[PDB]
Design an enzyme around this catalytic site. Sequence first.
Site, PDB file in Angstrom:
ATOM      1  N   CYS A  84      39.693  36.129  43.288  1.00 40.08           N
ATOM      2  CA  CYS A  84      40.863  36.394  44.125  1.00 40.08           C
ATOM      3  C   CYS A  84      40.748  37.803  44.726  1.00 40.08           C
ATOM      4  O   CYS A  84      40.652  37.939  45.943  1.00 40.08           O
ATOM      5  CB  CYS A  84      42.121  36.154  43.272  1.00 40.08           C
ATOM      6  SG  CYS A  84      43.648  36.632  44.124  1.00 40.08           S
ATOM      7  N   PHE A  85      40.714  38.845  43.888  1.00 38.42           N
ATOM      8  CA  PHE A  85      40.576  40.239  44.324  1.00 38.42           C
ATOM      9  C   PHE A  85      39.544  40.975  43.458  1.00 38.42           C
ATOM     10  O   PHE A  85      39.623  42.189  43.261  1.00 38.42           O
ATOM     11  CB  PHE A  85      41.937  40.942  44.497  1.00 38.42           C
ATOM     12  CG  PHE A  85      42.868  40.998  43.299  1.00 38.42           C
ATOM     13  CD1 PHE A  85      42.606  41.877  42.232  1.00 38.42           C
ATOM     14  CD2 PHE A  85      44.035  40.207  43.272  1.00 38.42           C
ATOM     15  CE1 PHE A  85      43.468  41.935  41.128  1.00 38.42           C
ATOM     16  CE2 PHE A  85      44.906  40.272  42.169  1.00 38.42           C
ATOM     17  CZ  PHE A  85      44.613  41.129  41.093  1.00 38.42           C
TER      18      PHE A  85
END
Length: 114
Positions: A84-85
């Site tokens: 995701c990040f």
Amino acid sequence: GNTDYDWKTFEKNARYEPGYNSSHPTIVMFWKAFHKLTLEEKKKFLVFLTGTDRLQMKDLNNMKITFCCPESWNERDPIRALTCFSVLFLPKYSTMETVEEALQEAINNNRGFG
């Protein structure tokens, strides 16, 4: 085995959760393991942390990792990660060896990641 890849910038530009810093014992010992391994080994790390394989220099020089230790982390919790990040789940290992071994565990495919 490093070969024309700016790794300093990566450890320098990484993110930490609020109240965490590279100066924290667990994080400095984590970076120590990341510096002794070879190019092949650190590529595996990035490949499970990110959603792109054999990432280019253009990717790496701006790539970041977000260190995280859940509210209920455990000394034996396996090192996981989310694309995701680029968050790397790192429990508060009591020793410098447990983090060095855990770094190897995940790059060596900790199994059950299906």
